[PDB]
Design a protein around this ligand. Structure first.
Ligand SMILES: CC(=O)N[C@H](C=O)[C@@H](O)[C@H](O)[C@H](O)COP(=O)(O)O
Ligand SMILES: CC(=O)N[C@H](C=O)[C@@H](O)[C@H](O)[C@H](O)COP(=O)(O)O
Ligand SMILES: [Cl-]
Ligand SMILES: [Cl-]
Lengths: 229, 229
């Protein structure tokens, strides 16, 4: 098949710019597609180049009210896997019904629900002409993600798997190691709290970066204030 | 008249603690009492001791969903005054129909609408058993606020009047100078962006402090990130 050509392409749009993650799961105070939409508007008006969002309802609302490029995920627990970021083809298919341009998925070394294989997920995303982002936790996972044909890798899961670096701050070391090894874009994502950290990520060769909670989780932002008192 | 005695009193509750301002005016993406209530829940869950809020509808919603103490204001422009933070008795009366425990008002040296006198507003607040906060821009304004019977003074308007220090950062000097000179509590309010600045304000003798946009205005938080790129 064929389609009209667009002038702007998501990876070009986000290069050197900020992607804002606008998520609020069911146990979080801002949980509401309406609210996530308004948070994405705020992000757009503060200069965000793209949005990362969770679930079909939030993705569809954000797309409608901002018209920014979106990295879509579905976060879902399965009884037979530790993976929750877009774990199976079921989630991929659900996301492919939204207009999100990129789909991010856990691309860790771990077994997926139903014993599904990450390559099948990437291929399905590509079969619909969407981009795939590999959320990884280690250097080796990043290298493998490139081999599997992901369009980009993100450091999202560093510190969120038991075998990766345990840290409460941005994993710059993983970022540094990835950029000297893989050729595809490496996106810094996880625990960026300050502009100075964002700047550092880009200075170290991150293609782009994603900030979520330091912008869109006022509970977390509040806590970082109250923790100093 | 008489009333039930409470164990907790607002000034004791906020002493050494953080107050979070949850505001979104009509030109802002989060303008909605629903969203401000959710911001206030987030702030509560993150350790906030009290909330500062604007407008009856937001104040009532925040009180309903958090049960925290509230510093209420009404922001309203008048054609005959530069003052917009609770400028007249009309706004005081509107706020007294809510349960907010403290009312803040501009206590600058400037003429109010209808030639009203700030002392009359303070007295009307006290007559209903509420506390009054003086939002000021200069040291002399802070010194006069105490004389006028305010219960506390805040540095809210420093940098927001033509004759006060113009700055994009917290006015620590005004804070220190008020702490040298007035006996009533001095609240640091305005342009606190980082936990380190919050700590600094308390270390300088602020009784409490208010953080607004750095928690509850994602557009502003996002811009501070994108400005460094
Ligand atoms: C580990 C995991 O589930 N991360 C999720 C991925 O979408 C989100 O919870 C994060 O907010 C996002 O990755 C951005 O990170 P941060 O909020 O730290 O800036
Ligand atoms: C000048 C003025 O109208 N200040 C208002 C006072 O309520 C609010 O816009 C501020 O957000 C609030 O004072 C807290 O300050 P900051 O958002 O800088 O932390
Ligand atoms: Cl939150
Ligand atoms: Cl905002």
């Amino acid at each position: 098949g064929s389609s009209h050509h667009h002038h702007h392409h998501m990876l070009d749009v986000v290069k050197g710019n900020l992607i804002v993650s606008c998520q609020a799961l069911s146990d979080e105070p801002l949980h509401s597609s309406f609210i996530m939409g308004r948070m994405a508007i705020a992000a757009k008006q503060g200069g965000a180049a793209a949005i990362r969002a969770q679930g079909v309802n939030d993705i569809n609302e954000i797309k409608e009210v901002t018209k920014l490029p979106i990295i879509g995920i579905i976060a879902r627990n399965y009884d037979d896997s530790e993976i929750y970021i877009t774990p199976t083809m079921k989630e991929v298919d659900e996301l492919l019904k939204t207009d999100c341009e990129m789909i991010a998925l856990d691309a860790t070394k771990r077994k997926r629900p139903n014993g599904e294989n990450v390559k099948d997920l990437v291929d399905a995303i590509h079969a619909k002409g969407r981009l795939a982002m590999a959320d990884i936790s280690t250097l080796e996972e990043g290298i493998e993600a490139e081999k599997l044909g992901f369009d980009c890798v993100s450091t999202t899961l560093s510190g969120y798997t038991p075998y990766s670096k345990q840290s409460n701050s941005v994993d710059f070391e993983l970022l540094e190691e990835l950029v000297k090894t893989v050729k595809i874009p490496v996106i810094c994502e996880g625990r960026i709290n300050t502009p100075e950290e964002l700047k550092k990520a880009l200075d170290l060769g991150a293609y782009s970066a994603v900030v979520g909670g330091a912008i869109t989780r006022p509970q977390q932002i509040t806590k970082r204030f109250t923790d100093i008192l």
